[PDB]
Design a binder for this molecule. Structure first.
Ligand SMILES: Nc1ncnc2c1ncn2[C@@H]1O[C@H](COP(=O)(O)OP(=O)(O)OP(=O)(O)O)[C@@H](O)[C@H]1O
Lengths: 136, 224, 203
């Protein structure tokens, strides 16, 4: 009742996924998502065996082999996931609130960058992303 | 019970929507879109529509003041004040048949009347209230002041697509001495090109229009 | 059983309301795709008419055997301008019909909810599901669609009503103010709502 198995995301299919949910997305089968009471568009919380966590958005896939959560490769690096492992998926009953101050630490150091339009690229491509300390 | 105040999202800006939790909607007994009068903490009041939060969590209040008392747009929430629930009321809205508005235009009668009908379409409004146009609105009306109505919007009411819109109107420093001698020398020149509704076109010429002020740096020429 | 009929009365009203919005969105995109080469042609005619207005027709030494050329050339150029503008008023009438029937269907949905309001609770409206969003989300999205259609129609109507043949810098700037109207809106609004409600519609 919560332990599923990871797989890669079905390719193509980019004309049936709304544009606001592009970079924050997992895919699930309809009977699996009906079983563990997850709704469409609501966030879910993912916990691995190492105790690393992530908050993403569910989409009805209508296809993925029943019992298979689909994640991208950045998610698999961020939680720490090889394809063929176990993961814990839960729905969120609490509250999500608007952030106002986010201390980010740049990794490495490329050309020091125009800061304000780097902030414009951050706030344009990442919108509605639920943040945790330690995520990339 | 105390509820917090939060700044509004980018989808509630200019929509007249109040975002409440489910326990406050159970205590108010309101449906979706019903009229809620909010008595503000720093004086004044506003009128809003009740819509639920997506999260389902109770203990938070957001509000967008569009129909406001004049000089009561104090809904900025930097200091995070808390509102009590005893200050929100469920207000019945009968439909109206005639309104009376006074428009504040941006810097003919039919375009101003068409822009008033278009702004006030399907909204709850009260008496002595300013309706502010949203940013990016088409047209020329920037604000409306509500003056009167025949089913009497003192406990407020709803404009309908078949109501009538009519236009009435009733809107209810250092002196520096020492330059007195030269202050009126300026007026004996400049008063005559200030009382000119093309009257000097009709009879006369134009006294000069090109004055020059001179003096030492510090006698207060710019303040004159 | 007693409360079974009120909620399914609102749900078939939403099921009737959404494909109407899909059909008029297709009509709106066809009219907006038709409007652009007419505006480019009107900018070309404004260039030709300003270049004719700059010039004197007696100092040119070849053009003395035809001493009436200016009003004949001006008459033809302005007969082509009237053709383009009547074609443009036809596109504006198509956008008006789209706006009117979308607003009537949304008002019908809110009227049937107001009739069946107090029987169903708040908690039946707020409940989501694994195939469908809640009733309150879909009503809010319908209200957003109606407000977007009203605002875009009046912005395009006032831009089309400010065209005069005594000021010609306006006619050469019209082309980019139309693209600035189309770039200021919420991008991909109707398609995201229809993709969210398609699982509720097909079931
Ligand atoms: N009656 C007065 N006559 C002269 N100065 C005054 C008088 N009353 C106040 N002041 C002082 O003069 C200041 C006004 O300075 P102001 O900027 O007008 O100077 P200015 O003569 O225009 O300067 P500048 O020559 O640099 O343009 C006031 O802020 C005040 O400190």
């Amino acid at each position: 009742s919560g332990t599923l198995t990871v797989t890669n995301l079905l390719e193509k299919v980019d004309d049936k996924i709304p544009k606001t949910f592009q970079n924050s997305l997992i895919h699930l089968g309809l009977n699996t998502m009906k079983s563990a009471n997850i709704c469409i568009g609501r966030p879910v919380l993912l916990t691995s065996l190492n105790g690393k966590q992530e908050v993403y958005t569910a989409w009805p896939m209508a296809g993925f082999p029943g019992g298979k959560v689909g994640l991208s490769e950045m998610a698999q690096k961020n939680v720490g996931v090889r394809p063929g492992d176990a993961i814990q998926v839960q729905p969120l009953v609490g509250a999500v609130l608007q952030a106002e101050e986010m201390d980010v630490a740049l990794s490495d150091k490329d050309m020091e960058i125009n800061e304000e339009e780097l902030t414009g690229c951050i706030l344009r491509k990442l919108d509605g992303k639920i943040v945790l300390p330690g995520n990339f | 019970p105390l509820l917090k105040l939060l700044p509004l999202d980018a989808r509630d800006r200019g929509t007249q929507r109040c975002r409440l939790g489910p326990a406050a909607l159970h205590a108010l007994g309101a449906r979706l879109g019903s009229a809620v009068k909010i008595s503000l903490p720093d004086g004044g009041s506003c009128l809003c529509t009740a819509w639920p939060r997506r999260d389902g969590a109770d203990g938070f209040v957001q509000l967008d003041p569009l129909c406001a008392s004049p000089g009561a747009a104090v809904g900025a929430s930097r200091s995070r004040r808390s509102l009590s629930l005893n200050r929100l009321l469920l207000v019945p809205c009968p439909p109206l048949r005639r309104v009376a508005v006074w428009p504040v235009l941006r810097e003919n009668t039919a375009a101003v009347l068409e822009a008033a009908q278009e702004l006030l379409r399907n909204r709850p409004i009260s008496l002595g209230h300013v309706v502010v146009a949203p940013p990016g609105a088409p047209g020329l009306v920037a604000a409306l002041h509500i003056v009167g109505g025949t089913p009497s919007p003192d406990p407020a009411g709803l404009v309908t697509p078949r109501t009538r819109v009519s236009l009435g109107g009733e809107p209810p420093e250092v002196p520096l001495g020492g330059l007195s001698e030269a202050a009126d020398s300026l007026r004996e020149l400049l008063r005559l090109p200030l009382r000119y509704p093309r009257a000097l076109t009709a009879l006369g010429l134009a006294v000069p229009r090109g004055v020059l002020l001179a003096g030492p740096p510090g006698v207060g020429k710019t303040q004159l | 059983m007693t409360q079974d009929r009120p909620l399914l009365a609102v749900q078939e009203a939403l099921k009737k309301c959404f494909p109407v919005v899909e059909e008029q969105q297709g009509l709106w995109q066809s009219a907006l795709r038709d409007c652009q080469p007419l505006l480019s042609s009107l900018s070309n005619l404004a260039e030709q008419l300003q270049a004719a207005q700059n010039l004197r027709f007696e100092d040119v030494p070849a053009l003395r055997a035809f001493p009436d050329l200016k009003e004949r050339l001006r008459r033809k150029q302005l007969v082509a301008g009237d053709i383009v503008l009547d074609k443009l008023g036809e596109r504006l009438a198509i956008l008006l019909k789209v706006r009117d029937m979308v607003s009537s269907h949304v008002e019908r949905v809110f009227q049937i909810y107001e009739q069946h309001a107090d029987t169903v609770g708040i908690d039946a409206v707020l409940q989501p599901s694994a195939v469908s969003p809640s009733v309150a989300d879909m009503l809010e999205w319908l209200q957003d669609i109606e407000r977007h259609y009203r605002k875009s129609y009046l912005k395009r109507k006032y831009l089309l009503s400010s065209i005069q043949w005594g000021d010609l810098a306006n006619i050469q700037a019209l082309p980019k103010a139309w693209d600035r109207i189309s770039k200021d809106e919420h991008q991909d609004l109707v398609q995201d709502i229809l993709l969210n409600v398609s699982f509720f519609l097909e079931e």
